[PDB]
């Protein structure tokens, strides 16, 4: 177990990370909610930085050393997450901006000010 | 494609080389109204084609009443040949 | 004037491959529409995944028709279990 | 194709009927007729078991091919005519051998078209093929449970099934009531929706016209006595007094799933 996928997802409200094998096999996971933040601090890239930190500790605990990372959703923890993952003793090889883009699909929910 | 138009043109052709002369035009639009009328009988709920049909019906009626005013004999032989009322 | 492109799946031995292209050429020519040409590209790697096949055979048949043989080909082609894809093109 | 009757009496006030447009003749074949008599819900003992039945206008059974055993022989649809036993109407077809058979007329079949029933037959409306030959997704009626028994599954007027993909020795079929079910791939099933399509949209009209089909009056249990129904009795306009509304016999009737729980066909069923 040497190589893997880092599925990072950063919403406006939360940031959740899964370390996975390439063939769909998850090792461990964490989030700001997993680390204890309950309020608006979940959205902060700093909480995303600790989430990526403890994901990297779980990754080293199983034993893989090289990654490529896929990011989902619009958020703020992009640079902090990838820099924590690369500076936590791991290697990153590729960055993927995998966000689900419908052509139109179903209609989006309503506005916030009606 | 476009042989029925040719055969009606030289059939209702009264001068040697005319393509105006409203008998030719009434013949052409009677064929066109019949073709489009069969099309609407297939597709009943097409409406823009019906608008085109009503426009050609108006064109044919105005040409017919002009032909009535100009010469009633040619109008009578045309309506007896075409068979529309 | 119809240029027709169809994709045959690659799990076909070449005997039955010429059998099925002769079958569909017979479908085109049995309704009074002679073929005006043909071209076999061979096997190419498709841009995305259809069912299990990353790749497949491309055939092009150029027909002059009275617009019955193309949709007879269409119904037989998408009712067949061995032709992956087909479109017809009316050339202008 | 539903002919409303203008109200001239109070019986015909809300009546509709079919137009019988597609039916082409009014004389069935004298070699494919079999006698029937009504039974009225009676039994081999003679007791009544089925309530609300018997008394209608008499009819005569037309023997109808459900098996489609004639493989390799093209037939011609001679007539489409009215069968009183079934909600669909049937088609007499003449095979090229010389004999004649009765099949169920599918949707959109016309007089004089060919019918080819083999396992090598192409897919047009009215052909019968085995389910390993029928492609995915096609509308399919007259499905067999067991090979050679006869078409049982989807047989009434205007009802058709879909094929949700082959699996091997078995084939997945979506029947009416949205019900996915596995049928062996040797079962010969016909192709096309069944061709009356309008039997639902008929207002009967009088009580007499429901009587002519052999339907007796249906009595609530609320107006019966206590020893004739669990609901009966009460000092006038009783509600359902019991919890769990009941059959006339001692079993509840709303929501009580009456299928046996250890049924041998539960391994072949996917959804419900």
């Amino acid at each position: 177990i040497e190589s893997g996928i880092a599925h990072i997802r950063s919403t406006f409200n939360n940031t959740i990370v899964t370390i996975t094998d390439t063939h769909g096999n998850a090792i461990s996971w964490s989030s700001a909610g997993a680390l204890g933040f309950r309020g608006s601090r979940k959205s902060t890239p700093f909480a995303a930085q600790m989430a990526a930190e403890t994901a990297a500790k779980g990754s080293i605990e199983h034993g893989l050393k090289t990654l490529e990372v896929t990011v989902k959703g619009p958020g703020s923890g992009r640079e902090a997450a990838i820099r924590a993952l690369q500076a936590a003793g791991l290697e990153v090889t590729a960055i993927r901006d995998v966000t689900p883009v419908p052509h139109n699909g179903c209609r989006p929910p309503k506005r916030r000010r009606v | 494609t476009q042989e029925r138009k040719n055969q009606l043109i030289n059939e209702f052709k009264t001068h040697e080389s005319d393509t105006g002369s409203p008998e030719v035009q009434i013949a052409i639009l009677t064929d066109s109204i019949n073709n489009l009328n069969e099309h609407l009988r297939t597709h009943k709920k097409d409406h823009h084609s019906r608008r085109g049909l009503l426009k050609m019906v108006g064109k044919r009626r105005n040409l017919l009443t002009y032909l009535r005013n100009k010469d009633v004999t040619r109008y009578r032989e045309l309506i007896n040949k075409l068979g529309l009322r | 004037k119809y240029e027709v492109m169809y994709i045959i799946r690659p799990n076909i031995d070449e005997e039955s491959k010429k059998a099925v292209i002769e079958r569909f050429n017979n479908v085109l020519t049995s309704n009074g529409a002679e073929i005006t040409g043909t071209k076999d590209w061979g096997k190419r790697r498709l841009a995305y995944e259809i069912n299990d096949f990353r790749d497949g055979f491309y055939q092009i048949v150029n027909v002059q028709s009275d617009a019955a043989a193309v949709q007879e080909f269409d119904r037989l082609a998408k009712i067949s279990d061995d032709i992956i894809r087909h479109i017809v093109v009316k050339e202008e | 194709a539903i002919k409303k009757y203008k109200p001239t009496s109070n019986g015909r006030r809300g009546m509709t009927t079919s137009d019988f447009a597609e039916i082409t003749t009014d004389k069935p074949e004298k070699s494919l007729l079999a006698p029937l008599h009504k039974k009225g819900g009676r039994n081999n003992q003679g007791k009544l078991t089925v309530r609300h039945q018997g008394g209608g206008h008499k009819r005569q059974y037309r023997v109808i091919d459900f098996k489609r055993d004639k493989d390799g022989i093209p037939g011609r649809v001679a007539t489409v005519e009215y069968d009183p036993n079934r909600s669909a109407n049937i088609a007499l077809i003449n095979y090229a051998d010389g004999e004649k058979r009765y099949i169920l007329a599918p949707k959109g079949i016309q007089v004089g078209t060919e019918i080819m029933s083999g396992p090598e037959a192409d897919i047009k409306v009215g052909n019968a093929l085995p389910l390993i030959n029928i492609p995915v997704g096609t509308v399919v009626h007259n499905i067999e449970l067991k090979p050679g028994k006869g078409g049982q599954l989807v047989r009434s007027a205007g009802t058709s099934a879909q094929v949700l993909g082959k699996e091997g020795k078995y084939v997945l079929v979506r029947l009416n009531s949205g019900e996915v079910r596995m049928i062996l791939s040797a079962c010969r099933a016909s192709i096309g929706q069944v061709g009356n399509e309008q039997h639902e949209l008929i207002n009967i009209g009088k009580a007499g016209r429901s009587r002519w089909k052999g339907i007796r009056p249906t009595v609530r249990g609320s107006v019966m006595n206590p020893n004739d129904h669990p609901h009966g009795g009460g000092e006038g306009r009783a509600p359902i007094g019991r919890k769990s509304p009941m059959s006339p016999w001692g079993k509840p009737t709303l929501g009580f799933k009456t299928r046996k729980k250890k049924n041998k066909s539960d391994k072949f069923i996917v959804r419900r």
Binding site: - | - | M5, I7, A47, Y48, I50, I60, R85, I87, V89 | -
Partner: protein
């Protein structure tokens, strides 16, 4: 700021030119805009019809 098709004086797209359509499509799978590529508007409409035909016949990718 120059059109390829009016530059070389070519007739219609001849829709099986997979390399030509692959050069005009972006690397993700998006059809390039007119303000970037520089073709005329008529040829842009013909190009996008060709590209959508190729996308359905699985010659050019949708996403990557």
């Amino acid at each position: 700021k120059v059109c390829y098709f009016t530059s070389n004086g070519i007739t219609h797209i001849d829709y099986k030119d997979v390399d030509l359509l692959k050069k005009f499509v972006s690397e993700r799978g998006k059809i390039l805009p007119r303000r970037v590529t520089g073709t005329n508007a008529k040829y842009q409409r013909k190009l996008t019809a060709a590209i959508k035909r190729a996308r359905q016949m699985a010659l050019l990718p949708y996403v990557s």
